[PDB]
Symmetry: none
Subunit: 320 residues, 2 copies
């Protein structure tokens, strides 16, 4: 938290708003396979700009996810809308993982994210790994410009869901005192947080038999390591898609004596692995060692065979 | 809000009388309710540690039967009956006097009640009740704040109070979570408690029960009208090496399914099939349960049937409420 980082944060914040002020059309993108924080940061920024600058044309684009559609509706726009437009990307550490490839077809590109800065693809890169979520960064932006009063029910609701998504509702280690203070203020806007959380947690009945496979086929070792391996034949047995299977990475997290676990889904020509750890244990390092990365307690790796998975395992078990 | 400020003013006099009693007594003993929850532990130990930190020379004790699931929160004190002579007794989180754990609570010279449940039984000499608080732990924090002692809070105080707030809010999920609740929990996290570690310890589950939850997830039957049934045969209990009572704690495993309105979780113990009946919103199912020889509350009832053929009639009866 050096004094220089802080000064650069203020300047970056100020620069972003000038880019917003100087642009009539603002288009906001997020990552493929969106989560609540993706939807909440994108839409929250959209609604914030729309409230502060009611003449500007602000759009939120990408492929909609039916599980998240309750958060808000996305915009379908023409390729011409991008001409001399400001493009902002939320929540996306790597440019290949952005959901619409037109993010580069504009005059300016801004990145706002809370993942370690490894791909500085913006002309402006706002990165704060000390934030719980990109949603929380968006509220920090609002607070910087003393606009906390323009926050209405819509902004507060989508930003609240985004913080909740990335903290597991204030559970994970990325929840700070600042995180709780923001979420308190958001609830202050009468958003009926219980109703929102109930909607977000509601389950598609057709996915539950697969979740039961996880509960019955997890492998916990006395070491504190656990593994769940989903083969291509399993996804076929249950009629589910690999992104759908990935949403069950934390199904086993409450097991007594759990320390490190990996959730591996063979997506065909690539096994997507979600690496998770308890406490101050570190897995982000082993993730980078295999071409992956993310948070030290929540990172992702892809391998190309089950023999290479076993190496991801062995390496992870050395960390105790 | 204006209304909230008025509510805080009504309690100020009570807060100051509790503290005077605390100051006036060198021995202070704190009780909570039988079958304790996180909030019961956290409010009792929170207040104990607060008094111990503000008055290091007083003798402050937290009594009651320990619960193995919650003992990580803090250890309870074991005292002889004579310790209550001319002592101050405080009871936290306990609406009704028959539910105070240790009966020695009346053996002292003063009784104080601190609680957040509806004031139906004002069993204390002094009674502090705030139904607008999320939890008794949140009331304890408000007391600390009223006497400008927020800096006296240490890791012990913040940890136990945080767990008590988390317990009665479902970790900031229920409607009793206010903005003020969130703000307090923030301040508590600011005392460098390891909240994820504390929570992990609280949510800790037995790996043996996970397989059976999976069966439940692979053998529920949702109908288009929103009715859902889980039928557990006695052979299944044997397969997963579980007991009928254990198996009944999975009644709400499917409660988050989209479209769900009424469900029944039915377990075949050799003698009878024990059915747990549940409903969403304003749907009533306890009239149906009464019709088949059981009963309970409108949204949560139980009935025993003697055959799966009787189960089907119970089911058919339940669905008449969905039409
Ligand atoms: Mg995120
Ligand atoms: Mg995300
Ligand atoms: Mg309570
Ligand atoms: Mg209680």
């Amino acid at each position: 938290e050096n004094l220089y980082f802080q000064g650069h944060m203020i300047s970056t914040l100020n620069e972003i708003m000038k880019c917003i002020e100087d642009n009539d059309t603002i288009i906001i993108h997020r990552h493929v396979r969106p989560d609540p924080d993706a939807y909440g940061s994108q839409l929250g920024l959209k609604y914030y700009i729309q409230q502060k600058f009611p003449q500007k044309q602000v759009f939120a684009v990408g492929e909609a996810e039916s599980s998240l559609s309750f958060i808000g509706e996305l915009d379908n726009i023409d390729d011409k809308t991008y001409q001399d437009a400001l493009v902002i990307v939320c929540d996306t550490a790597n440019a290949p993982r952005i959901d619409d490839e037109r993010y580069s077809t504009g005059r300016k590109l801004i990145k706002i994210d809370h993942h370690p800065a490894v791909d500085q693809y913006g002309d402006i890169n706002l990165v704060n790994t000390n934030a719980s979520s990109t949603s929380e960064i968006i509220y920090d932006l609002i607070s910087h410009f003393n606009d906390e009063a323009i926050v209405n029910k819509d902004i507060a609701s989508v930003l609240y869901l985004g913080i909740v998504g990335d903290t597991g509702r204030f559970l994970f280690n990325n929840t700070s005192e600042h995180t709780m203070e923001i979420a308190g203020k958001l609830i202050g806007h009468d958003i009926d947080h219980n109703a929102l959380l109930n909607k977000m947690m509601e389950k598609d009945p057709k996915m539950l038999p697969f979740q039961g496979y996880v509960l019955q086929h997890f492998e916990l070792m006395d070491d504190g390591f656990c593994q769940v391996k989903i083969t291509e034949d399993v996804l076929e047995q249950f009629g589910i898609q690999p992104n759908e299977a990935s949403q069950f990475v934390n199904t086993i997290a409450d097991i007594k004596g759990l320390k490190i676990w990996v959730f591996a889904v063979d997506e065909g020509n690539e096994i997507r692995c979600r690496l998770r750890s308890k406490g101050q244990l570190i897995i982000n390092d082993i993730a980078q060692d295999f071409g992956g990365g993310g948070h030290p307690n929540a990172s992702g790796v892809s391998v190309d065979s089950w023999d290479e998975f076993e190496q991801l395992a062995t390496a992870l078990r050395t960390k105790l």
